[PDB]
Design a protein around this ligand. Structure first.
Ligand SMILES: *[C@@H]1O[C@H](CO)[C@@H](O[C@@H]2O[C@H](CO)[C@@H](O)[C@H](O)[C@H]2NC(C)=O)[C@H](O)[C@H]1NC(C)=O
Ligand SMILES: *[C@@H]1O[C@H](CO)[C@@H](O[C@@H]2O[C@H](CO)[C@@H](O)[C@H](O)[C@H]2NC(C)=O)[C@H](O)[C@H]1NC(C)=O
Ligand SMILES: *[C@@H]1O[C@H](CO)[C@@H](O[C@@H]2O[C@H](CO)[C@@H](O)[C@H](O)[C@H]2NC(C)=O)[C@H](O)[C@H]1NC(C)=O
Ligand SMILES: N[C@@H](Cc1c[nH]c2ccccc12)C(=O)O
Ligand SMILES: N[C@@H](Cc1c[nH]c2ccccc12)C(=O)O
Ligand SMILES: *[C@@H]1O[C@H](CO)[C@@H](O)[C@H](O)[C@H]1NC(C)=O
Ligand SMILES: *[C@@H]1O[C@H](CO)[C@@H](O)[C@H](O)[C@H]1NC(C)=O
Ligand SMILES: [Ca+2]
Ligand SMILES: [Ca+2]
Ligand SMILES: [Ca+2]
Lengths: 94, 547, 99, 49
């Protein structure tokens, strides 16, 4: 969260209208975090400013809700198939 | 800086607040053809406006008392969340502007600071707000969030609440089901941080108690037609009459409407305290479906002069309140001049019946009251300390003129004071309180015709396991009209001349009856096996006993 | 000379996802770069300016992405932002030469 | 024939021998079938004779 608050400095200043440094780079997209718990906390803040986020390791199914996580994308499958595969493995060996 | 409409007053010490004045946001689809803009809140919440007035009443009562915090002034800054994460996050970013400025080293140079915030209602909103508020060590006292995930102090460093968590409610529901001798139930939970851990705790307890669960489904406020129809099909394909629901009114209303339109009757509902008194579900049009519900209620408190303060609201006198204009317009269905008729302005608020002043007990308003007094008493403790007796490194005292948020949090951690009801208020090491529970029943008023909540028992948390539940069965109407306990077992009891059987692919709660072989007998009302006959004895023809 | 997981590996599995994540954004920006007038995804077929691009435009282009990676396969996100992928099953053995 | 153990899930059970005039010809069978009208079970109640 501390690192993310510096990603959205200009947009946050514009939104709150508080307005100094006169030179703040704007981040177009963010390569998301590893853990699912961290990814949700980061996405809650990034989705305010519609900044896209592409995660590479997070695979929780709670992040597939587009009513809460508007700008979240993944390059890894979720865990429903993994749980089904574990059940299939257990059934295969009787 | 921040949202447009708000309640604000100036003072030496400023408090923040977050209340759900609206039930939700507009159900709009997001396409990015143009730049996105602010979403609008749709449904008004009259009960949530009364919760806001409790904070203002408590602050004004403190500011007029010379015995508590003398020569100081308390202000407030209250925003509306519409039970949505984004609005609360915007308000929180408004709260922590000064600390964040130095944290990022990124003008104004003179902004008011917030030392404490009165928390939110929902558990997910509270979690999202706490994640950001704990960065700068700003204490947060919640009045309605009861999720057990918020007791983890490794993650939520400055969270406190004035409501008990949700372990005891799950245990009490299991105790009630065990008390009424049922072993075949279903479960429905809301898909959030409030319903899932509670329903998981209920699942564990029941298994320990040898109770079989037939189905378990999840719902949401923004569910579509397909999911609702699937859940309805799952319910009506089952033979379990008792259904345990962990959820709130906004998250439960669509399913209840769909069940009502299909005329599905004969079900027994167990209600958690979130919707056990909700006016969205307690409608006279739904009584043939939800009548006879058994639910949980919190303890009630007394505020000596709250109603008189409530009755004095006006859109032209409440300068510091920005929600009073919309409150008036929604109450009287008129438009205030800068096609609804123009509001005259001299209209009594007692004529129109709304949840604003149509209440019997104060349960969450008392929690808001206590949340304000906790901060007030921590500040007083900071104010009345002597050198050498402080809680800091060398017994030093913080300055009341230059107080900081983390010092207030430290003094809140050690708080111990008595309230207007003569009881003591202390937070444990997890920042949690303990409280009793009340058990209510849904009846029908004979004259008015509305729905009446009737108390039929209580749950005692300070007792020992097995002696916490009290139920008075003679006060219970099982569907609004019945006086007999329903039957909610999977199968009938095997008689004394038979034994139990196994049905393949089914749980242990469902069985068949098989007679005993010649030369064997049983004398129980549920026998796993037919016992043999002693030597030189033979079984009777009915196999009831040996001869 | 020192054995660390930095260069002690046999396959690239999670480090290959960061490579693809970067190329996804790069290809979205490229698709922004070559928008002919009248064929945009915004109002009235207009396109966005690459010299003054914004985040929500890049998000809109990411939602409609369909390109090919260096291995010849197609990459595209579903309506939930997820992907589909094969799994592999492994077993833990012991190396006789080293342990 | 499978037998119920009280307070335990369905995956754990016990075996009981079939009666004199009934038989069981499978594995993990939850009941004993009766022989036909003019048939009687043999010593091991695994078939009718
Ligand atoms: C362990 O349990 C499984 C039952 O869950 C047994 O598997 C069954 O075995 C019978 C006889 O071969 C088959 O007809 C069933 O189809 C099997 N069930 C399944 C799940 O496929 C298995 O035999 C047991 N293993 C041992 C060694 O007792
Ligand atoms: C429904 O099932 C419950 C669960 O077994 C039955 O409750 C038991 O009844 C026996 C009979 O006296 C008691 O010995 C047990 O102590 C009871 N268990 C519990 C947990 O209370 C109940 O009798 C059944 N009801 C019907 C109508 O079949
Ligand atoms: C929670 O409820 C229990 C039961 O109603 C309360 O215990 C009672 O307290 C009153 C007040 O002194 C006594 O007169 C009763 O005899 C008590 N009943 C029992 C069964 O002990 C208990 O005080 C309540 N807890 C709180 C914090 O109010
Ligand atoms: N993808 C996991 C986290 C994870 C994957 N690989 C890892 C390797 C190391 C540490 C964490 C991970 C998640 O959803 O949370
Ligand atoms: N306890 C609920 C909040 C709540 C309590 N009472 C309510 C009444 C209406 C709506 C919400 C509530 C939660 O944690 O989410
Ligand atoms: C709070 O103070 C009262 C007396 O004022 C005392 O009985 C109680 O034990 C105190 N609380 C704790 C947690 O010690
Ligand atoms: C993506 O591009 C390929 C190749 O041009 C095409 O076959 C396919 O239909 C496109 N869409 C999807 C969803 O793959
Ligand atoms: Ca005072
Ligand atoms: Ca099954
Ligand atoms: Ca058991």
């Amino acid at each position: 969260l501390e690192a993310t608050l510096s990603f959205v400095a200009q947009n946050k200043i514009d939104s709150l209208n508080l307005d100094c440094s006169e030179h703040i780079p704007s981040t177009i997209a963010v390569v998301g975090a590893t853990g699912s718990g961290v990814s949700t906390a980061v996405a809650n803040l990034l989705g305010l400013f519609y900044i896209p986020q592409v995660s590479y390791a997070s695979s929780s199914r709670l992040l597939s809700n587009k009513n809460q996580f508007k700008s979240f994308l993944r390059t890894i499958p979720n865990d429903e198939h993994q749980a089904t595969a574990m059940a299939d493995i257990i059934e295969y060996f009787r | 800086y921040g949202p447009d409409q708000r309640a604000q007053k100036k003072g030496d010490i400023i408090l923040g607040g977050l209340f759900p004045i609206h039930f939700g946001v507009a159900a709009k689809d997001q396409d990015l053809k143009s730049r996105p803009e602010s979403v609008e809140c749709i449904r008004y919440n009259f009960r949530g406006f009364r919760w806001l007035q409790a904070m203002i009443f408590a602050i004004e009562e403190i500011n007029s008392s010379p015995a508590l915090l003398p020569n100081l002034t308390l202000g407030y800054r209250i925003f509306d969340t519409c039970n949505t994460v984004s609005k609360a996050l915007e308000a929180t970013l408004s709260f922590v502007a000064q600390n964040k400025i130095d944290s990022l080293n990124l003008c104004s140079e003179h902004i008011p600071s917030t030392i404490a915030v009165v928390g939110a209602t929902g558990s997910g909103v509270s979690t999202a707000v706490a994640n950001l508020l704990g960065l700068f060590y700003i204490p947060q006292v919640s009045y309605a969030s009861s999720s057990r995930l918020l007791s983890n102090k490794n993650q939520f460093k400055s969270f406190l609440r004035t409501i008990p968590n949700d372990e005891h409610q799950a245990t009490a529901m299991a105790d009630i089901i065990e008390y009424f001798r049922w072993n075949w139930v279903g479960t429905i939970a809301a898909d959030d941080d409030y319903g899932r851990p509670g329903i998981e705790k209920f699942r564990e307890e029941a298994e320990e108690r040898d109770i079989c669960i037939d189905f378990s489904e999840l719902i949401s406020q923004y569910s579509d037609e397909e999911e609702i129809q699937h859940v309805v099909e799952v319910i009506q394909n089952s033979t379990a009459k008792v259904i345990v629901v962990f959820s709130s009114g906004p998250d439960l209303e669509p399913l209840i409407k769909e069940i009502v339109r299909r005329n599905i009757t004969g079900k027994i509902w167990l209600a958690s305290e979130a919707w056990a008194s909700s006016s969205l579900i307690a409608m006279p049009q739904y009584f043939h479906v939800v009548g006879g519900t058994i639910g949980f209620a919190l303890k009630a408190g007394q505020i000596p002069g709250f109603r008189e303060f409530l009755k004095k609201v006006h859109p032209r006198k409440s300068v510091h309140n920005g929600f009073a204009k919309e409150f008036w317009e929604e109450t009287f269905n008129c438009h205030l001049q800068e096609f609804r008729p123009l509001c005259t302005g001299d209209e009594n608020i007692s004529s129109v019946e709304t949840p604003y002043i149509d209440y019997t007990h104060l349960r969450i308003s008392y929690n808001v009251y206590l949340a304000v007094y906790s901060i007030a008493h921590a500040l007083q403790d900071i104010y009345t300390c002597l050198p050498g007796r402080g809680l800091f490194t060398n017994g030093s005292c913080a300055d009341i003129k230059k107080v900081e948020a983390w010092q207030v949090l430290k003094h809140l951690r050690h708080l111990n004071f008595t309230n207007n009801m003569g009881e003591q208020v202390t937070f444990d090491e997890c920042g949690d309180l303990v409280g009793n529970y009340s058990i209510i029943n849904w009846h029908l008023s004979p004259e008015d015709g509305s729905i009446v909540f009737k108390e039929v028992g209580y749950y005692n948390v300070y007792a020992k396991k097995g002696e916490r539940l009290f139920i008075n069965e003679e006060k219970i109407l099982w569907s609004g009209f019945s006086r007999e306990v329903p039957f909610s077992n999977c199968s009938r009891d095997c008689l004394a001349g038979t034994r139990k059987g196994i049905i393949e692919g089914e749980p242990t709660c469902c069985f068949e009856c098989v007679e005993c072989p010649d030369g064997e007998y049983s004398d129980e009302t549920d026998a796993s096996a037919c016992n043999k006959c002693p030597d030189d004895f033979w079984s009777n023809e009915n196999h009831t006993s040996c001869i």
